[model samples]
Target chain A: RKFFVGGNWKMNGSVESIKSLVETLNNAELDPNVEVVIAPPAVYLPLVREALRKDIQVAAQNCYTKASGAYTGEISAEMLKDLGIPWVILGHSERRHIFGESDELVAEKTKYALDSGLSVILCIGETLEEREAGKTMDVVARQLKAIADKITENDWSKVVIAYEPVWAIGATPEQAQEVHAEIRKWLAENVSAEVAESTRIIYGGSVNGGNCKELAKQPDIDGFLVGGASLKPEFVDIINAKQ
Target chain B: ARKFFVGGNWKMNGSVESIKSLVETLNNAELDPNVEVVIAPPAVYLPLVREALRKDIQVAAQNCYTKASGAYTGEISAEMLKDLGIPWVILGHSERRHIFGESDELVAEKTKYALDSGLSVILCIGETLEEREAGKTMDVVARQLKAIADKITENDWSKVVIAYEPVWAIGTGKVATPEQAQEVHAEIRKWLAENVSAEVAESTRIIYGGSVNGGNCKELAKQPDIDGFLVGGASLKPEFVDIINAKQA
Candidate 1:
């Protein structure tokens, strides 16, 4: 499976800044082996899609469950599909915490996005408190279960699970690997063994060029769902870590 | 003291192509220059619409957050709207109140923030089907305005265009008769006179929304208190030009 690096530019960057970032990515010597996708804010998806390199795709930071209707202040998966945006990031920790999206709602959004033929970066992670209580795996399992119940085995092919630990946002590479490995093991047992083998489970939370090489060395750590560092020049370094 | 204001609320609809085409239609049409025309597209399309729309016709964000900026995922702020040259925002729509659980206090805070940020506001307020059937439309609107009144100082009403859309009327194919809308608008004006200022009462535009199409726009625009309209579904069609020109004669 190819390594996938998705930049979640969560609620950040203006049109000018986004254009600059796209230009940076355009000129960078990225590893052709990596599957690169950047999820800009919904307002700038078209702009990014138009400006960014053809090989590097664009994604919506979020999408509503409904195809189209009176859910004001929401962009739907169908709308994203109609716009030719190929991917969507659902259940980001920022969305799960800042917004009051229930697991059920995230699951519903994932189902709808996949149904609309858009790939999903389905984020699941335990909070600092849950990790302290030794319920990290349990929390991750429950979050995945919400989606598992709604999605069939065929839908798993369209999903890339991002394990973002709320507490380990800036934790060491070793720290992230421990949780990422545990999540892979849980997937093999709880979900189908095939899903465990085929799915690209990436690590999020403070992943940067400085630490990406070490994190990339871990067997289960397939790729990254980068946050703040994704906007910088070092994002190219992170993408080229495997090279 | 009042200019006829026609606002097209493209609520949660339209693709980028459709919006570009809609703006093209608006630009080509000879709208009444006497009327003030503003269209509120979905926030994602705000920048695109702003760039494409005619200079005389302004653009509004369908909604904005109270804070300037932060970690609030999937929310846009008033500061960003102002920074983008989006001069107006439509707050407190019935859809937001009913579907999204935006409280009066939240809407009021957003209004104060948007106004303070130097953006004009189309503030929507009205009763639900139950509230109206209970004969509490006046009370409901007063309560909704009271939320804003408490948050904002007396002079802040200048930046506001009060959109009195009945919950029962919006997107339901049910419109309030001219008398029904005029009565409510007149009450709003009276309330403003007593609570805010008479100057505000006279100058503010009290527009009606809820299934307003070209067929009913002329009569609705004729009401003394009804200064204009906050159009819905018809705003996407060719007839919206007619609604904008309702007072032409």
Candidate 2:
């Protein structure tokens, strides 16, 4: 799998700081083999997409389940498409656990986004209690199945599976390695051998530059969905982890 | 003087192509000079709509977060809105209170935070079908206002525009008759008089938000206590112009 790195800015950035951040990413000597994408807050989608380097793509942090309707204070997948945004992050831990998004809603958003001609980086994870209870793959599988039930076999082509452990969210390399390996096994049996081999499962949870390369060495860890480190210049180093 | 304020909430709608047409209709319309008009587009369209629309009318964000900025994914800060040169925000909309899980304290905290960031606010308060049926209308309205009052000072009232929307009336075909809306508006004004000050009561603009359309806007705008409107669905089209000029009738 080609190395992919995603920076989820996660509700951070001002106009001045974002401009500087974009300049830093644009000027830095990044590894050309890496596929790098960043999700900025929806409000800054227009500003950042226009200003950022073309090699790096922009995504919305989240989007609504419907194409368009009377959902006040929500952004629709249709609107994101209208802005020419090519990607979106759905079912992040904060959205699912804290913000009250159900497994069903995330699946709806994923299907809606794919139909709207946008790619999805779907995030799934097990909470602290779930992990401690020894239901790590059990929890992750349930979340993945919800989306799988909604989308067709071909739809998997447009999707990227992001394996973020809620337990280690805010990481041990061994901890991530074990989970990613299990997810790969589950995918081959549940979805398909081709789909399992084709799908890229990324790790996210305090994935800073200092420790990213070690995590990157894990076979199933195709890429990373970086959190806080994505917001700084150090993200450039993480992007180059594969090199 | 409370200028006749009308705000069109384009709420979770609009594409760049559609917004271009929306802006042209607004630009060409002969809007009333006496009325103060603002439009709140979804956060994604804030900068695009702000740049395209006429100068006399301003742009507002449909919602904002309580704090300045941090790890709250998908939430935009009032500071970001202000930083973008967007001057106003609509806080405490019924969808925010009922559909989303914003509590009274959360709404009030957001109102104070937005004000502290130097952005004006459209503070929305409303009663649900159940609350109205149970006769907790003013009780509910007073409680909502009290939460806000607890956070901000008398000075902060100047930056606030009270939008009284009955959740039952919103998006439903059911319209709040002029008498019903005015009664709530009058009670809210008196609540201000008794709680804040008589001057604040008189000077502050208390607007109506429901299924406000072009045909009904003139009559509703005629009510003495009704200062203006906070509109929806109809706001996405050209009829919003007629709502803006309602006071002229």
Candidate 3:
């Protein structure tokens, strides 16, 4: 499997800023071995798609389960498909904490997005409180269970699991490795061994050019889900970390 | 004292191809220069609609966040809309209130932020089917207005155009009679005069929504207080141009 590096741009960037960022990515010497994708805010997906290079795919920050209807202020997976956006990020911590999305709803949206023929970056993590209470493994497993219950073996192939620790977001490289190892071990025990080995479990939360190389060296850390650094020129270095 | 305002609430509808055709229809159609024409597409298509539509026909966001910017995923902000040069936004619509559980206070906060950020607002307020059956139409509408009235000053009214859409009428094929809609519009104006000021009440535009089509727009346009419309499903069609010119039609 090819190592994947995804840039979760979050709720940032303007039309001009995004154009310049695309130009930077287009001109940079990115590693051919790394699979890179960028998730911009939904409003800029079309603009980014038109301006960005063909090899680098575009993603929507979020999407609703329904194909289309009178759900005001929501972008559906079908809409993303119609617009040629090939990927979507679901159940980010910001959406889970701030917008009140439950585990079941995220699982349903994951199924819907997959059924609509789009790949998903499924985000799962425990909060600071959960980690402090020594419930890190339990919390992540429960979140993963919600999706595992809904999706089939085939669905797992299109899914790339993003492990973002709310507490360890800005922690040291060693801190993230501890959680990543536990998650991979838990996957082997709970989910099938094939899924445990085949699924790409990426680390998120404050990943940058400075720390990505060490994190990439971890046996379980397949790649990174870069956040703020994804918006900068440093993203090129992060993408080429394995090199 | 107020210009007639017709807004197309293209709620969660249209693709790039569909919106382009809609924009083409508007650009070629003969619209009433006296009326203020605006369309609210999904936020994803605002820039596309803004660039393709006629300059005279303004663009509005279906919704926006109360805060300027932050980690609120899947939410657009008033500042982003203002920065994009989009001049109007529709807040507190029945779909947002009923489906999304937006409180009156939240709607009011959003309206204030939008007005403060230099965008005009189409503030939607109405009663549900149950509230109307309970004979609390005026009471419900007043409560909705009171929230905005509490948050905004007299000056903010200058930036608002009230859209009175009954929950039962919206997308249900139950168009409120010109008289039924007039009664609510007149009551809202009366409330404004007492709560804000007579000057603000006289100057503000109060429009109708919920199942407004070209066949019925002219009759509704004849009502004294029903200034224009906040059209729903009909807004996506070519007849939206006709609805814009309802007074002449």
Give lDDT tens digits, candidate 1, residues A67-112. Answer: 7777667888878887788999999888887666789999999999
lDDT of 2: 0.90
Q: How many residue pairs clash in each candidate?
A: 0, 0, 0
Sort candidate 3 into its docking category: medium
Q: List the residue pairs that clash in candidate 2.
A: none
Alpha carbon lDDT at A177, candidate 3? 77
- Tell me the native contact fraction for each prediction: 0.52, 0.77, 0.56
Task: Residues B1-249, candidate 1: write the lDDT tens digits.
Answer: 698899998877888778878888988999897899999877667778888889999988888888876555567777777767889999998888887678999999999999999999999999987788899988999999999999987789988999998787665666578898889999999999998888989999999976678788888888999989988889889999999999977
Error of 1 at A180 (Å): 2.9
- Report lDDT per candidate: 0.86, 0.90, 0.87
What tens-digit string does per-residue lDDT give for candidate 2 at B20-102?
99999999999899898899998999999888888999999988888887877788898898889899999999987877788
Could you report the Cα RMSD, in angstroms, for every candidate shown? 2.6, 1.4, 2.4
lDDT of 3 by residue, B53-172 (tens): 889989998888888765666777888788788999999988888877889999999999999999999999999777887899999999999999999988888999999988876656
DockQ of 1: 0.53
Q: Which ten residues in a row have the lowest lDDT in candidate 2 chain A?
A: A164-173
What is the per-residue lDDT of model 3 for residues A1-243, given as tens digits with 9 covering 90 to 100? 478899988777777788799999999998999888898876677788999988899888888878767777778888788889999999998888877789998999999999999999999899888988999889888888898888887788888888887886437767777877787777778777787888888888788778888899888888988888888999999999999
DockQ scores for all predicted structures:
0.53, 0.79, 0.59
Q: Rank by lDDT, descending?
A: 2, 3, 1
